[PDB]
């Protein structure tokens, strides 16, 4: 019986074993890309030339 | 996706900790508007000139 008696206090634990890590915005993506930067790059060869 | 929302949503509620909230003073706008700063630009002006 006490080994009945654990076998359900060690579910009970395993099912309540929730948490510690939540979701708070799901990914999503930026429509303006963030490569090539057009004009730093633009600069750069101006400058180089 | 809207229940799944939800679902996220609701479950952040349960862990916030803190007291509460308490709304101390509601949103009012200041009339003199902070740009642009007028002087400042005319100085860089005129000094640039």
Redesign the interface.
């Known amino acids: 019986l006490q080994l009945l008696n654990r076998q359900q206090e060690l579910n009970i634990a395993k099912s309540s074993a929730i ?1 510690n890590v ?3 915005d799901n990914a999503v993506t930026d429509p303006n890309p963030v490569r090539p930067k057009k004009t730093i790059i633009i600069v750069i060869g101006v400058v180089l030339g």
């Open positions: 948490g939540r979701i708070i």
